[model samples]
Target chain A: SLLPVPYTEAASLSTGSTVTIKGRPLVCFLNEPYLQVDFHTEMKEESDIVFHFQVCFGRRVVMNSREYGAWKQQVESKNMPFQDGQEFELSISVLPDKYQVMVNGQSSYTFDHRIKPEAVKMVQVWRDISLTKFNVSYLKR
Target chain B: SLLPVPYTEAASLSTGSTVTIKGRPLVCFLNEPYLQVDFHTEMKEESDIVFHFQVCFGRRVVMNSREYGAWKQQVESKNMPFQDGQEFELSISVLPDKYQVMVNGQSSYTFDHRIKPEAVKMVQVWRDISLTKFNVSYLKR
Candidate 1:
């Protein structure tokens, strides 16, 4: 059985938008502390995960998706700005062709669009870290 | 008369909302470069400035506000996360009693609310940096 996870109320995630996650690792952070942001078309179970952003501390950041019940090849990155017991900021911006992600103020990675932007209706964050704040904003065209 | 600057269109700002500014300093950076986000109640010439976020380079960051056409005491910070010609991300989140700001993914400053949150109707940014992207998002509450 899984615990109830907190997520944004279903909202339209448009192109030229962003989701900022502000949090800190637990004081005794150890092993693989992760933060996962999943973009779903619908709030129901079995919905396609258009984007999966998972940051594995001291390991690798994996970006993947679940489409039609199968997982795609994961994009891996060793670049991380996370620190144990320290606060961090992760800004994920929706660009025209890809999702631009920045860690601690520097460009970290980009995930090319695999699913249509309009199909993303909800964003859920799960796993390690004490979440202090989270935000979703649409950029002006 | 001052020249007109483009900004995010008028929008309502609430507690748990965020305004993110992404940009870089010009390659041939000279003098002091700054970026300012002003919270306005209207598009008129005399709209009250609810919150003013200003960051200056070469010395420190100065954040202040204007009440009745008079500037308030400045909050100075020497924690600079910007470099010439380097990309940077700044995210400002609205809290119940203050505005929490982060630069390049680190806690930078906090500005206590001098005006009510509902009074902020617009966010405008302009200055020496070349803005690549900007966004505003509301947090899940």
Candidate 2:
């Protein structure tokens, strides 16, 4: 008696504008490290953004990307964001296509899936740590 | 012969947004990370933002608050920024109250006076990491 699921109207930014997340742990939530992603509109000019956390960790991966900008190994996993409450633990690795972002776990990033993984359906999860977990793969030649 | 300042075109959305500068070593020398300030337009939009950087040896600061939302890092010095190809170092650091910035040699911010800093004398700088060494201080509180 109920079947209503077909929405699309998220992706907002103003207070200066900037929202970039391109694959890999494209969104987050693999083991509990958490990497949230949420974007709801209609509510602009609300306020609240006191950011300044340059977290970086890792540099230990056998071989990949070939170097340059293809990225290789960057490891560091502390899981910070007010002690993980904010959440941001991305250490993905699904290969066969793509999904390689190791923030606290280190390995920087690597996302690929030009589109067609079922159009990616949708992976939403807001309020975790600015980014908790999001995976959208398919890029490995 | 540098005099032609007349700024009062407040629109919002950063009027111009683009900033980049990583850690190095500065407070004012050794590596010389500098950026001076002063560029307000009243509470309307001249909200707030101050940035300074100088790493390695020490010196790192970055502040932002248009009512307490984004950008934070009070003070600590060493001065940094020297990846290469410096750009738009600075063009407006006029102060009667605030709008001081220093990048590269590092001391990146000071935005408080909230507009009317002589109506802001039109300062500018862009990309390439901008600026290297410049001075102007007032810290005791």
Candidate 3:
């Protein structure tokens, strides 16, 4: 519903929680606006991140994890499914073995679970995007 | 006035003109938010820039001029007057030979005019900041 950017929510995740985000970049792709989603182990902004997904619009996507306040190995991808000047629906599902990312219903990227997804206590979406909707599906028991 | 980030305005400047901007960084300084102000020779976004001011919050500030679609000599400074988590008043005063930048009310940096101020036709304020007020004083005759 009503959301301001730099959005953060206390979150709980498992093997099936799917985080769905509907948003639009604040600027044209040529300007290189960014969209970042971070899964943290604590509610604090500086806490350790179990998963960090960052998108540089019209450029690249970087995936990594931050533990003990230090970043681990970074994974880079050029698989851009995002369109210019269009709203995007991003779905990130916590699978048993990996995090599956889908952009506009198309599978784009996946990251193996480096740490247990259950350790994620906060989720933050930030950078140059205007968020219209955010949801964390907890349907699986 | 009601203005958005990535704001642009057609402007004319003389030796005495001063462009003033009031805005706040969209994210915390720890996040390394950026603020960029560009003075363009044309209305198009990709046109040559007579003056470019970029700030990397909590890090550094860089200034340069873009000519023929290429960036010219870059000027970097660590003289930051911007306070974290505070709104800022930025003023750029056109001098006979240079552009003087004042953060708050104190001089922070200056770049000698590589091109006359008369060639500036558009002013754009962009990057990771929320703009509130922007104006170019035409009172200098």
Candidate 4:
């Protein structure tokens, strides 16, 4: 039997939501997998994307946004923590000024709020990897 | 700033899958809040629901299933580790014959497998309360 694949869900996010997506790639897996946690105003493709977090397997991580019908320049990070066929954890904390992202309990990146933080309606996770767990927590308002 | 709510995801569960969901409720929150982790063969309302783990705020926990178009009996647990407006962690491990579930790092219950374990394709979290952190992990197969 095959393990589970990319896990995605609706994140009812407010200003202080902290979301975690953890899982691993298939054993002996050789393809480049990615995890994308997106914050959008709606579930539609054309909705305003407030925060776009893309973690690729090729030791490259990119963050960006699509607002007002334009895609922002990608914010690239090279400190990749994802290992092949290994368990990994990714956390995204919604802060007032920006989104603090962590990998395996360490600081990974900070995505500044290009769009109004309150405008983010849903948080979605798109991954090609198998997951053991995924969850979102609402903090004090 | 407000936190996110109602997060769900597709779970790639295997024999070695270990999933965790963590969070807390509001300080002055009332009413019954629950967290449900469902294992489904497909992402549809009519799909075969394999394993269902639910934790309620009133110190009631239930486990059941809907396989072959029939709803199973509700397995209940009385020792609720979830405190009102306090943080809690729930973990589910898929073993060979049953799903070992734990709350706040203690044994909660075990649901024996009634369907093919590999048929489980997704895990869903439905929480009416607030949360602080949540995640899932897949170990070595």
Worst 10 contiguous positions by lDDT, candidate 4 chain A: A1-10
Per-residue lDDT of model 4, residues A49-113, tens digit only = 78888776756888888877567888898876777767888888878788998889999799888
DockQ scores for all the models shown?
Answer: 0.01, 0.01, 0.36, 0.02
lDDT of 2 by residue, A41-63 (tens): 22221111111112211112221
Residue B107 lDDT, candidate 3, scale 0-100 = 92
The list of candidate 3 runs beyond 4 A from truth reads B1-3, B43-48, B65-79
- DockQ: which is higher, 1 or 4? 4
Q: What fnat does each of the candidate structures reach?
A: 0.00, 0.00, 0.11, 0.00
Per-residue lDDT of candidate 1, residues B1-141 (tens digit): 022223455767788888887876532223234566778777642466788776666557777766776667877888777776578898988889899988888988898998887887777765445577878886444
Q: Rate the local accuracy (lDDT) of all candidates.
A: 0.71, 0.30, 0.90, 0.68
For residue B104, model 3's alpha carbon misses the true position, in angstroms, by 2.7
lDDT (tens digit, per residue) of candidate 2 on B38-91: 222343223342322223222343333222333344445333433332243432
Clashes of each: 6, 80, 0, 14
Q: Give the least accurate 10-residue stretch of model 1 chain A, judged by summed lDDT.
A: A25-34
Q: lDDT for model 4, please.
A: 0.68
lDDT of 3 by residue, B1-141 (tens): 258766889999998999999988876675568898999999988788899998999899999888997788999998889999899999999999899999999998999999999999999898778788898999979
CAPRI-style quality class for the chain A–B interface of candidate 1: incorrect
How large is the interface RMSD of each prediction? Answer: 22.6, 20.0, 2.5, 15.6
